């Protein structure tokens, strides 16, 4: 099948390049640019700021272009500067001169990754229902492409921490290739505003601010709470990646059947089910008395991504007009998720020193669980009452 294999490999090489960036970036500020941990807490503070004006902006374009590949050409274009840009540019620019200067160059990302990954999901999702395949399939490539790269940052990470990057930049042109050969064949922004008054959006978004925002904040300190469960910080962390590397293959496998499970259960129960494993993981983390537990727990993450990613599209397409699938994705499951993730992540911090972890997480469960349970009724569609 023409589109399936091209855009399936597209996810493979796209998320491979998140590979270099995702778990490696903090290291490359940490070690290779000797920047201080007191400076990297601002860099992230900017990479998100820009994204806040790229994510909605990418949503309207990703619909107005429809199946036109122009917006995905820009991304594949910017991704090619992976290699010259950190080596050539993002490297010298904040060291000799005030970081505040190079911090802007950080916008690179905001564009490519934080606000560009979901634009790749959404676009390939639209193609996913003009060809004959399921979005969960092919998207499953993302996990294995992230797993493949995930194993390589650490291994050559101590022999040539410039190839990981260089390797990523190379895959960007492979990404240009697959974008070209693949062959694939509305609204106005004032009709787009109509959705923001429609009360069916405020319920879906509510679910995101409630369940998904709470989940993506939690999974923020988790690591710091997992390392404490092994002897030495290095032995503890070492085990972590292994969980991440190994559990993503399950996730990819889980995603493989995901769309079959998703297609009948229906969209709403897909999100409710996703909300449940996120809720259980939030409250479960509080009751921790052993690692073999904090491992399991990290694995559930792979049990909640399949449904969520696949499920949200089934929801958005099923209950909303498809003339807005990219927009209400990049505004609800991305924009509104990140906008609220500024604020909790504050709150969580205060809770720790106020109620440590145990006491904090416990709260997340009720909040995450409460909202999950509430969205059996705020979300329109068929609840779990049907089966």
């Amino acid at each position, epitope marked *: 099948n023409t589109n399936f294999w091209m855009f399936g490999l597209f996810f493979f090489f796209y998320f491979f390049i998140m590979g270099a960036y995702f778990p490696f970036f903090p290291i490359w500020l940490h070690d290779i640019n000797h920047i201080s941990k007191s400076d990297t807490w601002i860099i992230f503070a900017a990479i998100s700021l820009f994204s806040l004006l790229f994510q909605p902006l990418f949503g309207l374009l990703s619909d107005k272009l429809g199946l036109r590949k122009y917006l995905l050409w820009i991304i594949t274009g910017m991704l090619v500067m992976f290699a010259p840009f950190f080596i050539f540019i993002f490297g010298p620019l904040l060291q000799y001169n005030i970081l505040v200067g190079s911090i802007v160059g950080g916008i690179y990302l905001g564009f490519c990754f934080n606000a560009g990954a979901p634009a790749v999901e959404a676009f390939i999702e639209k193609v996913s229902r003009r060809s004959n395949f399921e979005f969960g399939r092919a998207r499953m490539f993302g996990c294995v492409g992230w797993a493949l790269c995930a194993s390589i940052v650490g291994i050559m990470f101590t022999i040539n921490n410039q190839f990981v990057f260089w390797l990523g930049s190379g895959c960007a042109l492979i990404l240009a290739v697959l974008l070209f050969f693949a062959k694939t064949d509305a609204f106005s922004l004032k009709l787009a505003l109509e959705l923001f008054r429609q009360p069916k959006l405020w319920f879906l978004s509510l679910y995101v601010i409630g369940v998904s925002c709470t989940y993506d904040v939690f999974d923020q300190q988790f690591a710091n709470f997992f390392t404490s469960f092994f*002897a030495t910080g*290095e032995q503890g962390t070492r085990v972590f990646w292994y969980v991440t590397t190994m559990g993503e293959l399950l996730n990819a496998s889980i995603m493989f059947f995901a769309p079959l499970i998703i297609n009948r259960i229906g969209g709403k129960n897909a999100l409710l089910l996703a909300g449940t494993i996120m809720s259980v993981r939030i409250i479960g983390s509080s009751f921790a008395t052993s690692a073999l537990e904090v491992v399991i727990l990290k694995t559930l993450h792979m049990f909640e991504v399949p449904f969520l990613l696949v499920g949200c599209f089934k929801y958005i397409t099923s209950q909303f007009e498809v003339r807005f699938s990219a927009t209400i994705y990049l505004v609800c499951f991305c924009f509104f998720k990140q906008l609220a993730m500024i604020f909790m992540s504050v709150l969580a911090g205060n809770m720790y020193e106020s109620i440590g972890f145990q006491g904090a997480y416990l709260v997340l469960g009720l909040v995450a669980l409460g909202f999950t349970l509430i969205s059996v009724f705020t979300l329109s569609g068929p609840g779990p009452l049907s089966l």
Partner: nanobody, 130 residues
Framework: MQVQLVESGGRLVQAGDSLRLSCAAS????????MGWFRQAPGKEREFVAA????????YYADSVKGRFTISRDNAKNTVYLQMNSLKLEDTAVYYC??????????????????????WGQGTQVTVSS
């Protein structure tokens, strides 16, 4: 945050004898998620001794002290113990309790890493005779 830990115990003891250290915690009762004993002499550094986690009571001890020491707790009255048997001569050094509670940035620390805990107690020296 200010919770605080108070050690008791320690005294002179003869090679082969016993001691019982206790560590009270004034504030605590939600935060500290894990308690440990660490010791320090001269010559060398802070050395991990034993760790335990309130909820559940799972214990860990750095090899050099297994079977010889027992770390226990008793929530019920904000206190963690170290029962030290078969003492030796090397076993002389200031013993500290420490408790965890909040997180803290870097490449993360584990259950033997001193830098890992968010709080400490003053001390109570322990001298085992030659």
């Amino acid at each position: 945050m200010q919770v605080q830990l108070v050690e008791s115990g320690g005294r002179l003891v003869q090679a082969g004898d016993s001691l019982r250290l206790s560590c009270a915690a004034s504030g605590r009762t939600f935060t500290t998620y894990l308690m440990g004993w660490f010791r320090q002499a001269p010559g060398k550094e802070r050395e991990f001794v034993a760790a335990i986690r309130w909820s559940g009571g799972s214990t860990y001890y750095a090899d050099s002290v297994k079977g010889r020491f027992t770390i226990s707790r008793d929530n019920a009255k904000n206190t963690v113990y170290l029962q030290m048997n078969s003492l030796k001569l090397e076993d002389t050094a200031v013993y500290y309790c420490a408790a965890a509670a909040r997180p803290s940035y870097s490449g993360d620390y584990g259950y033997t890493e001193a830098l890992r805990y968010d709080y400490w107690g003053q001390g109570t020296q322990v001298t085992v005779s030659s």
